[PDB]
Every structure is written in structure tokens, then in C-alpha cells.
Amino acid sequence: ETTALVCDNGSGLVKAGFAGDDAPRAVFPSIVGRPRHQGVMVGMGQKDSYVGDEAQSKRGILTLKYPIEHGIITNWDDMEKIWHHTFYNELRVAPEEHPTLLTEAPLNPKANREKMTQIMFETFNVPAMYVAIQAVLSLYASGRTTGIVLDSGDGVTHNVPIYEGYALPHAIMRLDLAGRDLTDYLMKILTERGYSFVTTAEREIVRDIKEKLCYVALDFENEMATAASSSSLEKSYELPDGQVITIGNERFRCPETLFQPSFIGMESAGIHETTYNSIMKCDIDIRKDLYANNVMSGGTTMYPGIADRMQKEITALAPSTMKIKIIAPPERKYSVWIGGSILASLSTFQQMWITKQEYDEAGPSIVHRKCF
């Protein structure tokens, strides 16, 4: 009949699809490119800007911009291009026909929700929509009503404790470390080895190095002692021009900055200490049930060994007599989408949508009272 669209804007990947199918059928980077060189050949069909996988294919000749930086949409005209491309080109669905469900990080400005709703109603003319918290959806995806969700995408990291379906909004922690600033750190440490990646395309190459070769050390000091003392740890990767580059301790040393943000020069503590300091803000009757579920979400939690490092040092911080259990399904990169796909297909949810009747009556202000 009619099936909601479910869209998660992220940073980096857009992923979108229809409610009640099991994986997104559009996934592509949320990137806009504009050509920067003088075009020479007459009659080429040359085009003003490219979106998504087009801008990855041509990235040699483009400045690549991300319209979202730390879950905040900084540039609105490019974000409309990305949604227009999602509905018409990727899904090939006319948005007037479908409720749309949109996903957002907690504790970010209200103007961001007001603009997302004003755009979905006025330009797309979407009949109904909703804006959902990213972390809440990872519990729907993992089959739980309880747990402290740790979520890290590109941009924002956040913890959200939930207990029997009640959020605990005073205990939500948000941290700007994750994912892009690991890549801007990797580009900085690789220069120490004599490789230089400056342009916005070379940043996409370094992102691919990070996704292939990085992993998290169980003990960071033992592995720096080992990698100083051996070649055994060292892997080599082939650049798009067929050069080959060799990467040593940099590969474990890059994601360690999740646990020691002082490397990039942040004040705040690592993801293990914001998780523990988030459980410490919950009342003592529930902590046992949060230590027994920690749900990792989003792509920055995909590094090999990040679960076993998290469990090791949270088991160091926690009281001795408790199970600490880290839940990290292999699919977790899609968990926020899968959870929104479940949520948008419930029958109880069909009264939750903001309908255009209400937007016409109350204006975009409504989103704050009706949505979370």
C-alpha cells in the first residue's frame, strides 16, 4: 500500500530504503562535488555538481564537500541536493506518496530539526514525517528494551542509557571525537612516515586505508613496544596509482585515539570513561542491568578488537563483582537503519507521525513538542 521511507542522514554514508525491508537499498556517501578545473572540450554535457557515487567516481577533478559536520547540517542547499538525489535517483519514489522517517543525534541544535521539517513539508511535500534519535533505534535493532547504547558514526559519538523503554535524559553524554577526526589524525601521523595526503580526494584515500588496515590494540603499550621491535606487525596497501605504501604502528595507533582523545588534543575522556561516567549518572537500582547490556552501533565501532578493549577497561573501572557484557553484532553498521525500519512499520506508531495538517496549523515549531 504505502510504506514509510526510512532515511538516516549520518555523516558520510546516506542509507535509505523502505520500512519493513531488512536492509537499505540505497547506500552512498553524503558528499557533493563541484568541478574546479577549466573545462576544455566543447559539447561535453558538463554538469554543475555531482552527488554521492558520481562524486566518488570523478573525485580527481572535484572539490568534495560534506554538508553535515558533527551531525549538524552546515550547508542547506547541498543537503537538499542530497535528499533530492536520494528520493528521485536512488529510490525512484515520489515523496508525496510516503511518510518519511528521519534520524538525528541527541543534544544538537533545535534549528536543525526545524529546518529538516520545514524542508520536508514545503519542498518535498511529504505527507507525514518524524524525527528519531539515532541511539534509540539501535535498541529496536538489537531486540532490547534496556541497555546503554554507545553509538559512533562519522562525526558525533553518544551514549544513551535506556531502561525498560524510558530514556534517562540527564545521563546522555555526547562527544565529537568519532570518525572524521580519526581520519584527520591518520593523515597527520602518516606524514611522519613520509606520505602526504592533503586534498579532499586524498582524504578519501586515507579513509579507505583506515577502514582496511586499522585495528585496536588490547594493550597499547605492549604493541608499541612490539612494533618498535619488529617488522611483524607491518602491512602494505596499494594506492590508486599503483604505488605501494607500508604502514607500521600507525595502524593500531590511529584508533587508540578513541580511548585517549588527548592525542588529537581534546580535553575529554575516552569512550570507555564516558560510558562508565554515564552509567554512574543512573540510579543504583538499574546499573546492574546496564552493565549487562552495552550495545555498540555505527561504523566507527567496527575496528577489530574494539569490543574486547572496551570490555577490558570497563571491567577495570566497574565494581569487581559484576558481569560486563559488550554486545556488538556484526551488522552494527546498519543498526540505526534496521531499528528505524522496525519502528516505522509498527501499528502503534501510525499515530506518532507529524501530519501536514498539524504543520499547517502549528508551524515547524511543532516538531519539538510532538517528536522527542
Binding site: 558533527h70 549538524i72 552546515t74 541544535p109 565529537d176
Partner: peptide, 7 residues
């Protein structure tokens, strides 16, 4: 952002 961080 609008004050503290750059976005």
C-alpha cells in the same frame, strides 16, 4: 556549531 566548535 555557532560558538564553541567550528560547525
Amino acid at each position: 556549531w555557532x560558538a564553541x566548535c567550528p560547525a
